[PDB]
Symmetry: D2
């Protein structure tokens, strides 16, 4: 079985694919631009991916990979009544380019079924777009669209750390995403079956995508403070389930 793993408790530029306004400042993945005075800037778009393409399914064997990612992010808005737009963990083609800004989070073009994009994303959305979004702040699973196929409620804590875990079991074809705010003892979880064989390509770039608002006032920081990732691809049998107990302790702590 082929495996690929990494742990970034501190960020570096050389092993990441930085796109647009994404930059590594003082060990922190600052996806959206900030001023030298500490002010978030509007109309920003940033993308950061791992330098190694990751195999999530094989053509010649028909086997799906089991993979898991963890990360801690912090979204800091000067005003909590005017934030936009949010950040996402995405899997995208090897040389895929940034798309529409703002509510599309640099990942999608529209709310309809766009199979050509070939992108699966777990979004952490802090702006109500109406055209697709639920009423309050939410975590969503995005399949070839910004209109999430499933969502859950996210009681967002302004400027507090958010510890995330995203797991995909190939045998049950289930994508599970959870968010905990350690400062407020709050917990949130999403789970939905997604088949990666027909949605995503064999090789993908794994990383982050974030935007700010299309208006001057709707601004936030979109920093990623830590990020661990693991994947296991089976040889011939469908797949064996991954180990999650030793995943978060060796990576997140």
């Amino acid at each position: 079985a082929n495996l690929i793993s990494f742990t970034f408790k501190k960020f570096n530029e050389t092993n990441l694919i930085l796109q647009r306004d994404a930059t590594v400042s003082s060990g922190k993945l600052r996806i959206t631009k900030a001023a030298e005075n500490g002010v978030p800037t509007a109309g920003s778009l940033g993308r950061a991916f791992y330098s190694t393409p990751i195999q999530i399914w094989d053509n010649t064997t028909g086997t799906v990979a089991s993979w898991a990612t963890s990360f801690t992010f912090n979204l800091q808005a000067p005003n909590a009544a005017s934030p936009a737009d949010g950040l996402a963990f995405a899997l995208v083609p090897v040389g895929s380019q940034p798309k529409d800004k703002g509510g599309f989070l640099g990942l999608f073009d529209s709310k309809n079924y766009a199979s050509s994009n070939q992108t699966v994303a777990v979004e952490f959305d802090t702006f109500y777009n109406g055209g697709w979004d639920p009423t309050e702040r939410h975590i969503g699973i995005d399949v070839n669209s910004i209109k999430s196929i499933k969502t859950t409620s996210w009681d967002f804590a302004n400027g507090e750390n958010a510890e995330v875990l995203i797991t995909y079991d190939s045998s049950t074809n289930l994508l599970v995403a959870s968010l905990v705010h350690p400062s407020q003892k709050t917990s949130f979880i999403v789970s939905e079956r997604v088949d990666l064989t027909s949605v995503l390509p064999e090789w993908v770039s794994v990383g982050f995508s974030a935007t700010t608002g299309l208006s001057k006032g709707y601004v936030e920081t979109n920093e990623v403070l830590s990020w661990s990732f693991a994947s296991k691809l089976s040889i011939n049998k469908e797949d064996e389930e991954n180990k999650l107990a030793i995943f978060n302790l060796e990576g997140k702590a």
Copy 2:
């Protein structure tokens, strides 16, 4: 830092401390009793704990361990009109013997706070008990009491595999517990701060405890199919959750 980890994708009697009715049958941990034909027995208790004691906190240095556990369990009742009582993952003292059965889940004696227990449990309760339980099915965090300090609703599906992950971050004192039913794509989560230095002893045994109903009809199978665990205790002054569920569970 000292580490301790294991993965039980198939169970063995040799490396577990079996208590009461808990037994290993065809590589699957049956915590409560069941007939050769497949029907669960009423009024049963079982406990299964790992062989080596795990250090959660060191008194002299003050350092507290970060740990994570993943397991898949199967609760199957002949009739959903009468299910009892439930199963729990718990941390207990070294020489901990089974306590009161039934609603107390073999881990507690009374509804009031008793420091003599020194038990931290994550319960997966399916029966609506008396002066301690919330209205529906629930996950709970038990601390020296059967009355959970915090609960979350859990839509339980009969005879369907539940994927559990429990995590304890030392630096933030946060105990998080999650349950996913992959068959119907349902997920549930709870999080609460627990001071394990005040509650647990320095060395603990980790594992399971389950009970069937005290009445003759209220019966269920309390099975655990897989179980992976890891712990990390520092030396002088977080755990990798990504690689945990893969190598072990995932």
Copy 3:
């Protein structure tokens, strides 16, 4: 796939089975007697094992487990001219007791292959017993016999740390034991095809056994400073070695 892993950097008395003179003090595992002055004592015998039994071959599935260990040991002798006897990493029946004191290392009875004991050991010999030992200080593989099945020449560095790595694979069966002395920048390696189904029972306890001289001036310390171990039993019909050494090594 069943897994079991742990790493030591500082030792404790709770997560180990301690036999005879085996003592834990200041976080270091002292297998043989060291007086309240810092002086080693002759005639001492000790055994230290992990409290969890480890499966090395399963009968019903017909597969042999692949394991690996890594430990830093220090042999501090007041006189290099009279050193006895050494230490060994061993796989032994779960509740098995130490045997002959001295050159037999508290593991074996005689120089002949006796599979009533069922003990596989990797010795680090620092005394010349001659009847079964080569000329000088040596690292050997012991299978049911104190007379090693294979040995390699070992430049024993007195009072210096020795970082060992022992590996066993299922596909190749090549038991490979390597020792490095970082201070002297030296390295030595042993390799022989051993099959565990012919020797050890389904379940064993892994750990260490060390002895001092049968004389009165033959004194040395047999300390273990760190200890890692990982094992994997392949279900149905190769284990990683790189991702292990850094956990406890890298």
Copy 4:
């Protein structure tokens, strides 16, 4: 602790960098341009590497990283009297190109010490030069030059499957390289302490540097069956050893 690891049991081109005369195909890693008939070509330079650069030491803390690797590499030559030249586990800089062919192993320009090369490699020599080499076959460490300071003796097994383990410890600066034969039992080991903060830079491309001779007579093949790697960076003045037992079972075993 910044972590990075991967285990190949089945190689792919999509996650492999190629330099000069490298090629990735047919269920193995043929580093040199081999013909259809299985013919070793002389006057070549193969270079296969992993996409992510790997950190050796930090600047903001000054902490050296411990790493470990394991691979099953093969050297096969028709004539026993003419083996040339071999391969080396290259830690070549990211922004660096291949150099001289032959006895230089595509790593260094001259036999003299030069800190501009910034490369440390584990040599697997087969040809007799002697100007910067011992009297026979040798496995050692190259420091800022093709000339070695300490090497071991090795029996050149003609086309034998051999599992290798190369490990590094930051605390004692020791590089331990072992080579075992599952069929022949001929095990060999070498270790030497060299400071890497003085020699190597922060980030390097990690893989294999392989070369052939100048004459058609002196030829051999270079193949890799399975390859594994792990690396750990310490945080604040640890000077500690990394786990080694948990790694070797992931790929090899």
